[PDB]
Structures are given as structure tokens and as C-alpha cells.
Amino acid sequence: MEYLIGIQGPDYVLVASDRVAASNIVQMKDDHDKMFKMSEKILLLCVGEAGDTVQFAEYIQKNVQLYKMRNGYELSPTAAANFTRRNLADCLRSRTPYHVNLLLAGYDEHEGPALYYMDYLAALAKAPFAAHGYGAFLTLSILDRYYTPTISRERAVELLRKCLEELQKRFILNLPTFSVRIIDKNGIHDLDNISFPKQ
Amino acid sequence: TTTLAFKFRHGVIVAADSRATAGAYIASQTVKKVIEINPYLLGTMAGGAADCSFWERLLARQCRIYELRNKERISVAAASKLLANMVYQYKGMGLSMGTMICGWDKRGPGLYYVDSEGNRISGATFSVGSGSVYAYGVMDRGYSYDLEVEQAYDLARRAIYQATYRDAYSGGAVNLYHVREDGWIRVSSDNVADLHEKYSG
Amino acid sequence: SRRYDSRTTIFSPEGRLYQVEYAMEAIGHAGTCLGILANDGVLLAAERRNIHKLLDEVFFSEKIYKLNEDMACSVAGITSDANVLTNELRLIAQRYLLQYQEPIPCEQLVTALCDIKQAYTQFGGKRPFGVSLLYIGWDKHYGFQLYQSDPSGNYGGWKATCIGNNSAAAVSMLKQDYKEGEMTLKSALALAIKVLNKTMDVSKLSAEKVEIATLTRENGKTVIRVLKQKEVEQLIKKHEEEEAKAEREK
């Protein structure tokens, strides 16, 4: 439903969800956070049934830290992505399935940055730029004409601006405020909250 | 059915109606909805009587066990997490429960909102029930953080009066609870007709 | 029913443990193994139990068990007792790979096997696994490695390991002839040839009595070289020329 974008760079991953926690008519919470800092270079975003989102984040966020304590080091983004896919694919054929839509943002020392893309039927994907929800019908074509693999981060933030400006022009939902993270050789750095005065 | 809760500088205000119908038929006008969990917690009854009642009583039992094991009062977020985990195990089996978890924390003011759908979220203002949107309207007119005590009382009371005036599924007495830093206190319990005579002019 | 119970796990009348010490002494009367310090590469040595002339030798491995694609292990003790552990061990590594699709980083592998062993040490009251066994392998986080499991479940990362009464003197030779820096596999093979030349009572060291396998890193692969016999033969001739070099001091 709501929105979250997934742009990859050469050496950074620029993810940005929204802050909306509405219930079918009214916007109950307009500063909500959907971000779960797994490791020092691995982020995770979630979209779907809001009873399943918190539960599956509670599973992964409290299992990867267990791996961290046991082995004395940190997962690859690849193995973490596959581990999440494995848990979805095992949880799907049960009496209690999960209906979530993830995308994972990681950073290796060796592979560098990495982006994965989940789905409610547990499919892996190694995408250059992924999205979710209804926004994802527009905001990928708003992007696929101005994407360059060797793009700098200020161009990327500008392209976020250019894309949100076209989001809030022809879209029935409200979506006033977007939070923005970035990953680098250091770790998770939070950029400023991107909101808009419309008119 | 209309409940609301909002926290501010001087703690938390919780008010609710007392009307709990049955279809088109009113059962009672004096159903006490704000379930008093602890001497430091307050829970609500938002959608379904028995589910809210039962699970909040079980949560009270759980929290008393916790305090007796740790010689220490539980946090608010902890109780919200426990309630969400207990409610989540019956997903889809037909539980309606939209209660609110209020109380004072080691961090201070704490306001969480737990659904039978499991939408466990914090926040600053909330309103649950059928006529909840009316409370949202008049409250987010009158809301600030820097409000006074009597100001907050008037805001909540006026809100429940407007909600019971427009929507049909709400009415009866308007209770009024106030969470301080140390303990909660009932402010008053006012009838709709008294408020109508008082506020109509 | 309760006058047929053995000790099975219980502490002594004096403070010590019974089955653990007897498992160690069950280890002691077995074949001899060792591994060497090599920065690139790592090797294993092994002695042939049952070197009688009417066998087949068509298995290409009597002590080695190529357990992952980048790990094998030598072994010492009761044989099928260890074969159970090889089956379970390959199973654990392979279900790790099923869960992650990334190869096993080998220390949590070793702890998994050690926990399997320890679960029969405390409760379960069955005959404990009287088998110590080595580990060679490679990873992304440390490179080439060496490990020593024990029936206690305690595991030691060595750089030059230890098997029992046949190999305590081998470890004495390892300390008295410790090497550092030379990752050269061939100097290590000459060293191991010298070690088993002292420790085994096989006179003049015919190659039928021994078994060597290595593991080198080749360009994305970490191949496991269970090497053939002719290079062992010329290695022995090399070592006895070095014996002639040693008796140049006469």
C-alpha cells in the first residue's frame, strides 16, 4: 500500500520509507518508523499486514543479533537476505502465513553495497532500484529514465526530490513526510526528514 | 462507543463514554469501560466487552507476576508488547479488541495502542470507537502540548460531549481519568444532559 | 533394573570423571595423525591401521572424509562410531548451506559436533564417542585453519595438533622443530615425513603404511588433494637423501 523506494548507487544504498500509520480512514500516526537496524551495515524495510510486520521484524532483528553474538562477527547482506527468504518460504505453507513485502539494504566489505527485494510469495531479487505499494506504479518510471549506475549521492537525493514531487502531484494518498537513510563504508547515516508543503 | 487518550506535559488524560448497546438495542448506559489494570496502569474497552475485559485482566495478572519477580514496576511498552503477543496468537479467529494502554514509565509519559489486528504503536493522541473520528476533529482542534490541567479536562470533556452528540452508538456518563507521575486519579463522571445544559449556552 | 545401571555419567569418589578419561585412553591406541602450519594450504598425515596384504584399497580414503567441498577431516578411534559422526556432520554442514546458501565457517560446525558429543557426556547415559578427530579447511574470515575435537566436547584450534601415545613424542618433535613463516608445503611435507619416520615403527617408511591429503586454494575453489602414491615415494627418497645429508656430519 503505502510507499518505500530502494535506489542503489556505486558505493551507497539510498532507502526511504514513509511515516504513515493510517487505519482505513484516518491517519493515526504521522511520524511512524518502519526501519529496523539489523547490523552496522544491514537495514530492513517492511510493508504489509501490520500485525505481521512487527512480528517478522521481531523474528529477524532478534535472530541476526544472536548470530552476531555467537560467531563474533557480522553476516553478509546476501546470507541475511536469503535467511529472510527461507523463513518466509517456510512460513508460507502453513496454517499461519505472513503477508509482508520486504526489501533489504546491506553493505559488504567485499561485495560493497547490496539491495534485495522481497515479495509476499518469498522471491529473491538483486535489483538496482525497487519499490513497493501503489507509488511503485509511478515512481519506477519516474526514475528509470534518469538512472545512471555511476551516480553520485547528491544527484540521488535530487532524484528523490524530483520523484516525490511527481508522487504528490497525481496520487490519491496523502504521504506528507518521508524519512531517508543512507549506507556507506562507515555505516547507517540518517539524512534529514523529507516532507513537502504542497501548494 | 467512543474513547480517547492523549498525553501532555502534566501526564495523561483518559476519558470514555459508558454506552454499550447490542445491535440496535441499548443494553446499559453505565458500562464502565476504562478498565483499571493497576495502581499505575489504565486500560480501555474498545470493541467487544468480553475480549477487552478478559485480556486486560490477564495482562494485569501477568504484570503483577513480573513485579513480584523483579521487585520493580513494569514499563508501559512492556505491557503493550505482552498484550500484543498474547492477542496475536488468535489472529483471524474473530477477536475484536482495539484497546489503549496508558501509564507512567521510567521514561515518563507513555501512550500505546494495541489492536486485535496487532497495530502496536506509540503516539501522542488516539481515539478509538465508532464516533472516534469526531473526537479526532475536535481534539486536534484543541490539542497542544503546553495545555493546563483544567484546560485539558475541558478539552477531553467537550470532545466526548460532541462525540456522543453526533454519533448514535455513544452516550451515558462521561468518565474522566488522569494519570499523574505517581498514580492515576479519577477526575469526575459527568452525564451528557448536564454537559448539554452547561455548554449549549 | 537399578542394580544393572553402570556409572554412565557420575563423578568419582575423588572428584574426577570416569568415562572421559577412559575415552581418552580409548583414543590412545589408534592410528596417528597430524597437521602442519601452512599459510597457503594445509595438510594431513595418517597411518594405516591394518596394512595386511589382502585388502583392496579401492575407497581412496581410509581416515580422510571429504565432508564439505572445502573441508575434510582425519580421525582416530572406533571406526563406525566415527562414521555416525561423519554422517551427522555432513548433514549439519549441508543444512547450514540449505539455510543460507553460503558455506559453513567451520568453527560453529566444530561447536555443533562438540555439542552433539557433550549431549551424550552429561545426560543420555550411553557410551560416549571415544573419538578425537581433526579438522582442515578454509573460509572467508580466517583462511586456512586447524582444529582438534575431543570426547569432552572441548575443541582447540592448534597450528600443529596432537594425537595420543604414538604422537606425544611427535608433538615434542613439533615443538623442538617448530617452524614459522615458511608456508612452503614441501618443507612441511619433509617435516611430516621426518615426524612419522621417528614416531612410526615402520622401518625405512614404505609408503603403503602412510596416507597424506592436502587442501590448497586454487582461484575460486579450495580443492582437496588426496594425492597419489608416486609423489609420496619420491618424497620418501627425498627424505632419505636428507638422512644422507644428516650423516654428512659423520
Added chain:
Amino acid sequence: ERGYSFSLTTFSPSGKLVQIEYALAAVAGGAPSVGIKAANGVVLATEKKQKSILYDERSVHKVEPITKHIGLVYSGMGPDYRVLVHRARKLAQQYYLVYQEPIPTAQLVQRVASVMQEYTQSGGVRPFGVSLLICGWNEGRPYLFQSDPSGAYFAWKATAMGKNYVNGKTFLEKRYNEDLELEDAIHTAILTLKESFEGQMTEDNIEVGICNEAGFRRLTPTEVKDYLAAIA
């Protein structure tokens, strides 16, 4: 039952397992046998002397096929022997269910030895006093696998198990060699079995099975009396 579930077999101060060594001694006190792997086939031969002249040689059969191409003999006690035979049968047919292909003899010996090893360790049961001699002609090269009560196994060019098995072994080492045919292997097998058996040896005292590349074969007393009527 109660499920008392403890094993009777624990370590000595010497580190030995005296029940397993006693089971090996009980095997060694059993009936002799000889099994020889030739260049094209494998020959199995046992030595079966009835206690009286009343017994029949048409009911109990020592030499036993597990598949149509895998023979199996023993030297020990038939009541344990039949059990592990039946276990091997069900096991091999599970393999043929999964893979739709005849199970190789190495895979048999892995699985059977694992089961037998499991009986050595599990609760309260005695080990099985049976030494197998498994063989079969899988993929051209034939094989010959001896097992034991300890769960271990081996691979022999030729061996013997039973009474005076060391004496038969020492005759095998001098007489047998690497390369012969199935007939010459049968010849030297009957020689080494008749070295140690009683004097009255007939078409019913012995029981011989061979292993062609065409499959396992269990010979008849007709061709035995064709051959063992003073084979040398």
C-alpha cells in the same frame, strides 16, 4: 515395556568394550566360510554340517541374495542373521524406491554397518554375533566387503571367517592370488574349505553362491556334485 534405555556396553580402564570382544569371540566360534573375489566374479561358499542324518537341506539356506545381484553369507547365529538380512532387504528396496536403480554394495555396507553400529550403542540390547561377507558385481568391477559385530567393515581380496579362520587365511595367502577366473576361485575356495572341515564332505555339506556380472547366482547341488565330486 518400561523403556529403561541404558546401554550395557561401557568403557574399561583399558579402554576396551568387553561385550564386543566377547561377541567377536562368539563369531569366531561359529561355522567356517570362505569368500574369494576373482577377476570377473566373486565366489561365496559356506560349510553346513547337520547335527543328525534327520535334517533336510532344502529349508534353511545360508547363502542368500539381497538383490538379484548381491549375495550375502555369514558366520554366526542364524536368528540374528535372518533379522539383519530382512533389514537389509527393506533398506535396499527403499533405495530402489528413491532412486529407481540397483543399490551399490558400498552403499549397502554403509547403511547396514550404521544400523549395526546403532545396535552397539543403543539401550540394553546385545550386539549381533554375525560376521557378514557381502559382495556383488556393480558396474563391472566386483567387490567383497566383510563386516563385523563392531559395526566396522573392510574390503578383502579373499578372506575367511569361522573355525580356524587364521589357518584358512594363511592357506589363502599362499594359494590364492590376484587374477583367476570364477572356476579357479571356486576350486581354491573348495580347497581351503575342505582344508578345515570334517572328512565327510558332500553336495549338501557345502553351499556355494557365485556372482557373475550377469548377476548373482546361487548354484544347485546338481552342479556342486558336478564339481565337488573330487575337484582335485
Added chain:
Amino acid sequence: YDRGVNTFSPEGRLFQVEYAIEAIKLGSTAIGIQTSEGVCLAVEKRITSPLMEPSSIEKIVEIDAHIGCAMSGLIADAKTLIDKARVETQNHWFTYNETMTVESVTQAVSNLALQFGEEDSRPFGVALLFGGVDEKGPQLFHMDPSGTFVQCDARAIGSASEGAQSSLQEVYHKSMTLKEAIKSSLIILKQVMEEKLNATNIELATVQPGQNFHMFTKEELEEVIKDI
């Protein structure tokens, strides 16, 4: 192994229960007195090192808002008993909106005081003093490992309990007051202990019908001690 878990005597009762009653004796002593004004309760911590922090050693634990406890001998078995008794009192409140009274508490404990069984594990090694205030006023309860639960007016447990019970029978009567019973109890405490009596040795636990909360005295205990 010398007639273990499940065997009677040629003359009398079980082996291992008798051994449990023997095993109580090595524990540290404690004295509870029932007064109609309220139940008072005392214990000795037996502290060995200056590193041994006094306020972490628990003897009096708190079952409910109006029910105390005291223990003997072993420790963590008693901790498990305390845990389960707390759970069961909370279940009683959960299905009854009231207080599980002190006798019902002790019955819920002694129902598995002896459920020791290794087949179809060992008996517990702790004697417990229970104090609470029911609707019939105050109560003082004493149980044992063997489940043989009785009501005591003023019970003394554990080490040196012979002379403790004797000299306690010397001074007790029915119409005692609170503070008199408190000082009379700590007299017996410093007569049966071996160290000097000071602020860290003992701890008092007093429950009243009007003072249901806080069944404890903290460092007013120092003032209570210096009045002897």
C-alpha cells in the same frame, strides 16, 4: 544404593524423607511469632565475607501483598516453590477477584511438597515459615519437606532450634504485643547466633492488617537493635 528413594522401614517411615528432615538442620535459623496485632518474623543471614553484600541475600521473600515467607537450608528449591506459589495466588486472584488465604496457599504448596517421583524428582530440602493476614486476622504457618503442614503460634526452625523453642516457650503467651514480641525474638536471635548482633546480621518482616504493604523494616532495625 542403601535402600533409596521408594522404600519403607522395617519399623517406621521412609528413608529419604527422614534424611530431608535431617537436612533441614544445617540451615540458618529463623523465628516467627504470631501476634493478633500482626505477625513478626526474623532470620539470620550468616554472612561470611565483607564482599558478601548483605541486601542481596534473600530469606524473607514476598508472596502476595499480605503474605510473607521464610526458608531454611537449601536455596533454589525454595525459590522454585516461591515462584510457583506466587503464580498460584495470582491465578486465584485471576479467577476469584480476591486473596488466596494463607492456608489455601500452603495447601497449594504442600500438594507437591511430596510429589517426588523419578518414575511414572527427589524430595525438596527446605522447611518454610509462612506468615500472612487472612480475613480471620493474622496467621502463622509452618510446613516441612514431608508436607505435614500445621499451624504454629511461634515456630523456630533450623539450627539450634531446640533451645530456641524452649526459651521461646519460656516467654510466650497469647496476649503479647508487637514490639515486645519483636525485642523478645531478637533476644533469642542474639542468644543463638555466634557473631555480634548489628545492622547487617538479621532482618525483620512485620505484617499488619492496617499495614498490609511493606512487610519489612529497613534501618529502623538499627534503632530496634540499640534498644536492647
Added chain:
Amino acid sequence: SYDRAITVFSPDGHLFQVEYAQEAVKKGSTAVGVRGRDIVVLGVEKKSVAKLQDERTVRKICALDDNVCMAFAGLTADARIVINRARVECQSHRLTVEDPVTVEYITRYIASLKQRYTQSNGRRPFGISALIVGFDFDGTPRLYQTDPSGTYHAWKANAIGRGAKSVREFLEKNYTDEAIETDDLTIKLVIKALLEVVQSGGKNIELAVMRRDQSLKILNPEEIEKYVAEIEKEKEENE
């Protein structure tokens, strides 16, 4: 299961296994630990390596969370089981209530596990004794120890392993609240206590600390050499 109790009472009221299996902890590696006002200090002795081999895997001091620190004695395998179990437990506490785990909760878990492990049907009790150091509630420095019975027991300093009576008797003179309470002097005087071991090779010392907001830091034997040198300097100054 095995319907047989290892924990039968004595004729005179003891347990033949619990107080007896404490002797395995008595026959183990020594490890001490104190709590300062801000920095906590602990460490193990008797590395006893072959002087040619590895020791980064034989590490006896580990962590469960970022705020708590471990130690043990006795035999190492039971400690490994308890450590992995407790890691799973504290991370599952994180799955519950979202605080950092208090030290008292995790010690209650460990001691309770060991106790109900002694109570059950035919199971050899864990012959270890852990030291659980952490500062969570507003950074309040604590350390608890265990017992093979499973009785957690809060101290201010501690001595286990071989000859702990001698170590606590060095602590007898080393109980001063002054002790002049720098971090370096607290560490070096704990190092003097561990250098009061029966052999005191000086290089078998393995010590690690925590500054009650940071994580675990392993030291280097050159600052330890400077600490030994200044300890000998103070021993010369007393003369």
C-alpha cells in the same frame, strides 16, 4: 528418560553430587573480578599454551549482550552449553521487553536452569561456576557469581578456581575503599592479585575490562608489562 536419581540425600543430610561436584570447579582455572565505581575489571589466569600454538579460540571471557560479561571455572564444555543457552535467553528477552537485559534477570535464569537441571531425572549437573559482570541500571556496577547448586550470590569482588582462599586472603589486605580508585590502579592491583597465583609467570595473564558504556576490550601484554613494572616500583618504594 532414565528413572534414576543422581541427587539422593545422604544418611546425614547432604548431597553426594552437588557439593562434591563443586570440587571440579575447585580443580580449575582461576579467575578474579572486581567492580570499580565506573570501570569493571576481571580476567582469567593460566593460559598454559604450548608457546607455538593458538589461543584466540580458547577465550574463557565472553559476552552475552553488549552490556554483560562472562567468566567461568571448572570444565569448559558445560560452560559452553550455559553460555550459548544464555545468549539465546538474553536475545529472547530482547524479543520481549525492549530494555537492555539486567544482570539480575540473566543470573536468575542461569541459576534456575542449573537448579532444575539438578532436580531432573538422571542428569549430570554442570560443574562450572560463572562470574556475571555488568552495569545496566544507570550504569550501576554489579557482579554476581554462581554455584553448581545454582545459588546466585552478589559480591563486590570474587575469587574462584585453584587456591581461591589465598586470592581472597590477598584481597583481605586489598579490600580498601581507597585502593586508590583509579581505573589503572584497580586493574593493576587486580593484576597483582592474579600475579599472586601459585606460579605467576607474568605472561599467562588474560585480562579484559568494560567502561560501563563501551564494549569488551582485550588488553596487550605491554601495558600489562608496564603495570607489572610499576607494581615492582611500588614494591621498591615500600622498602
Added chain:
Amino acid sequence: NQYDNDVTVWSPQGRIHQIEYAMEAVKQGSATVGLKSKTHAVLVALKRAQSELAAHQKKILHVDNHIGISIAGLTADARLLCNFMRQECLDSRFVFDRPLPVSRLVSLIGSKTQIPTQRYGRRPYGVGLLIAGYDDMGPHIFQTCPSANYFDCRAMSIGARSQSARTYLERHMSEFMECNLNELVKHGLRALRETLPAEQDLTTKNVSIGIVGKDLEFTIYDDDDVSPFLEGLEERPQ
């Protein structure tokens, strides 16, 4: 003596000694007496104490509206069989909606105690039951044993030094059938005052009496409704 270990082992004289040991352990409880009229079943027990200050360990305990049991031996097994007893009463009370006849309940008790005397890994129950009840054919005084060879009597007496009490029951079992409750109860304590040594007297606080009648619900009494019962006596003939 090495066959004298467990419940399962038979003797080479056939007498399984564990049951004999359980009997002797039952003998070292408190004394108790149960006897019935044509219309009233009275059971009378005696309490002891641990010390002077402590209260007395109670023996006569309630079961159901027409059943009360005495007890001798262990109290844990007593409360266990009490739980089972109340359970079996209320189960048929639920299903058939009638009170139980006593004899089938005691058959259930004997079948319950049959198993732990028969397999290996359980012990017999140290237990001292004296059951008084009302079916349609009136009062019944049943007793059990750890061997579950439950008896019906007209007056039993089990516990410490109970044999002289049985001699009293012998010399007044003719008298018992006719009388009403008052002198029946004082016959009962005219057994119990011979269950005691003669240098002391039966006081109030140590004695307890439970009556059930054909119209009377089973009711327990202690010292206050026993002070009427304790008067009406003379001294012993010293």
C-alpha cells in the same frame, strides 16, 4: 534379607515384606475409632501435637455431604487420596445426579491403590482410612489398608495401642446397635480414654468427633461442640 527390598519381589515364604512394612508404618499414626448405630455413624479420632505452643494436627477431615474419613499414617498420601475421593464423588454427582453408595467408592479406592502395590517404581500408600457414609441401606463403617484388603465391620480401631480399644468394642458391640447419639459418642470416647496411658486424662483440644446420620449431614466438631460431649463421664477405675 536381600529379597526384602522392593514391592515386586516375592518372598521365598510368599509374604511380600513391603506391605508388612507399610502396615507397621500405618500402626504409628494417631489412634482412631469408628462405629455405627442403626441410624448414626460416628467416628472419633485423637489429635497430637509437635510441641506445646503449636496447634494439633487434624485427622477427621470432610469429604462430601454424607462422607467423612478418618486417617492414620502419612498426610501427603492422605490428601492425595482425599483429592481423588472428592473427585470421584463429584464426578458421579455430575453424571448420575445422585450421591454415591459407599461400597462402590471403596471398591474404586482399592482398585486405585492396587496399581502402586503391583508394579515396580511405586510404593504402597501409608494410609489409615475409616469411612462413614449413607447409601439407601444406612450407615457403613469401612476401613482400608495399604494392601487394599478393605473391610466392612461394625466397629474398628486402628492406630497406636488400639487393641485394648478393640477389647472394649468386643465387650460393647452388643450395646452399640440400639442407642442414640449421646451415649454412642461417649462409648467412643470410652474407647479413646483407654487408648491413652492412665496417668493423664483426655482434655478437649486433643479430641475430635464426626457424626453423620440418616437425616444428618456429616459435621465435624472441635472443643466447643465437644464440651457437651465431654461431660457425662466418670473417672477411670484406678
Added chain:
Amino acid sequence: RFSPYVFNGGTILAIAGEDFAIVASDTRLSEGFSIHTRDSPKCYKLTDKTVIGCSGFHGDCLTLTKIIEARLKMYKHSNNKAMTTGAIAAMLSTILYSRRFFPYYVYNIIGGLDEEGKGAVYSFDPVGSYQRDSFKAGGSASAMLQPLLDNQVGFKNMQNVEHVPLSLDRAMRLVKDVFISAAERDVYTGDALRICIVTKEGIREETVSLRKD
């Protein structure tokens, strides 16, 4: 196919007095367009100070009554004392939620005295919630009886009408009036009336007839 419920109807009244709890109920058991009997009193006298009435599906009423009696005896045989009224109410609430996902189709009213000795009426619902009210009318005749009690018990929507405490006999004639007036228009009501009075001295019962159609 098989439907597990059937509507039997019924009418239970309760009035919380100052020191009395009056519970009355008709004794008509019907089904659809038939009459099964004219004697089935919905009330049940548990303790000396507690009377419960149960309407709705009749088999669940019987089963629930028997389970409540069983748990009463369990509490007594464990804790040597009778229950209160509110304890019984809480226990019934636990039961009704303990069969949440296959509910009882039963309305319930527990009257009785508290521990102070005052009237206390605890209403219920099929799912298991409760509250302490002053009067409830349960079963089929709820809407025919609640506004008249709102006028008479609550003194509501009235002007300058002072509050007299409800006496015993005035409440008695109120119950007789409301049952006649409700038996006029309702189909599930008539043929008897079983009036239960809880005092500080025991339980009194009283039977007054009605119209026989």
C-alpha cells in the same frame, strides 16, 4: 443440516434492593410454535445468599448450572468457606470465556448478597463480560421490561420526583405488575412465576400464577 442452537426464550428479572435481592422467573419452556411444559423454573438457589437464573438455550443452562454447582463444592472442599457473590460472578465470567470459540447461547443473572449484606445484581452476556447493576431483565422480554424499570427503579426522565429507597413489598408488587404487563404482549412468557427472595435469614420462594394462554 444440524443447527447446534435453538431459541427457547424466557424471562428473568432482578432487582438489587438495600438488603434484598429479588429474582423472579416464569416457568414456560417452549420451542418455536409449541409448548414443552408449564413448569421449568429458571432460578436456582446455590448458597444461602446466592440465586442464579439462566435463560436461552436450555441444555446449556442445565450444563452450566451443574458446572457451577461442582465448582462451588470444589471451592468449599478446598477452602473451608463459601464463596462471595462477586467471586461466583468472576468464576462464571472465566467459564464463559473458557468456551469462547463455541459459545454458550445463555443469558445469565446472578443476584445475591455481598459481604456487607446488601443487594448485588451481576449481569452477564453470552461471551462472558459482567458488571454490577441495580436491575436487569433477561431473555425474550428485555425490551418490554427495561424502560418500565428505568421509570420506576431509576426514577429517570421524571421531574421533581424525589428518591425513596425501594422497599420490599413495593418491589414485590412491581414484579407482579411487570410480569402481568409483559405476559400480555410477549409470546415466550406465562403460566407461572417463581419469585425468589434473598434475605439475611435465608431464601424464600413464592409461586403466583398467570394467564394460561
Added chain:
Amino acid sequence: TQNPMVTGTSVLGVKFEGGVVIAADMLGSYGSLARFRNISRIMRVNNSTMLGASGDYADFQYLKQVLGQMVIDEELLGDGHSYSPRAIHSWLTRAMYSRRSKMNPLWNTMVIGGYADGESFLGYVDMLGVAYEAPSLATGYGAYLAQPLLREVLEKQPVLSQTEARDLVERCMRVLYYRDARSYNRFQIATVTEKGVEIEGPLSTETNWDIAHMI
């Protein structure tokens, strides 16, 4: 049973002075085909109580079996205590409720008649567990049809004689033969007294058809 295959039909019982008379017919119709026109739909339990049922006949056979087993068991107790009829009523009620709670209903409608200890008894048991006592019971269509005859005479006269009751049952069964499509002119009367239980034979009715000569 979800689908009742072979149904009986209505059963009639009524008390009188010191006895209870129960009478049903002997028909085993399936659908509308009267496939089994000679069956017994009344069990004579041991000495006092007596059972009559409707609905699926197989379930009646099953309950007949289980009750016979239990009654034989208490008779083999040898104590002198039996089942009261109301005890059987209670047990049967709990049985039916336990069946319907597990979504396995036993498709029946049963009538229990017994006389014990001066007092008569006439119990009713539904499929749904609805169970009560009554001076006159009527199952199936009888609760519509023959119930007004019973309630007329019992209101006009509270007690009865055996002869009055037997004749009235005969009249009611005649009427049920007149206007019920699943009826049959063959029935048995079963009567309990203190002198025991007695099942009379397969009686029939006297019909009238003089309305048919009108147009």
C-alpha cells in the same frame, strides 16, 4: 449422525396412579417407503425404568446396547442398589449433550418412563440435550397432534386410572393413524407398575371412514 436414514415416529407417554404407560408403533419407514414394518421401538429396562425413542433406529440400537451393558454392570455389583429412572435420565442427557457438543448429534428423541419408590417418572430427552419432566409427553408430530388431548384431560382431571390412560392412548394412536404420513396400524403398549415391566403385543386400531360417502 448428520442425515437420519431410517426414522421411527412419534411416541406417547403419560403418567397415572402408580404407573406410566408408553406406546409407540412398529414402523421403520425410509424416506416414505415403509421398508421395515416389524421392529420394536421400546426397550424394557431392568425392573423399573423403560425406554422409548424416535429418529434414527441405529442410534436407538446403540443406546440400547450401552444402557443394557451399564444396567448389567450395576446388577453385577451385587450390592442391592440400582439406577433410579431419573438417574438414567441424567446420564442420557449428559450423553446427548456430549454428542452434540462435538458436532456429532445422535438423531433421536427419547422418552424415559419409570416407576420407583412410590413415585412415578416420565422423562424427556431431546437430541439437543433439552430435557425435562412432564405429566404427559409427546414426540415428533405428537407434540402437535396428541398433546392437546393429553393436556385437555389432564387439565380437566389431574390424576387418572390405568384404564382411562390406556384407552386415551388408544384414541391418540388412532388419531395419529388418521393424519400422519409416516404412521402404521400396528403398535405396542408398554406399561410399568410396581409389579414390574410389561410389553403388550402388536395391537391395532378401529378406524372410521364414514366421511368418505360425502362428496
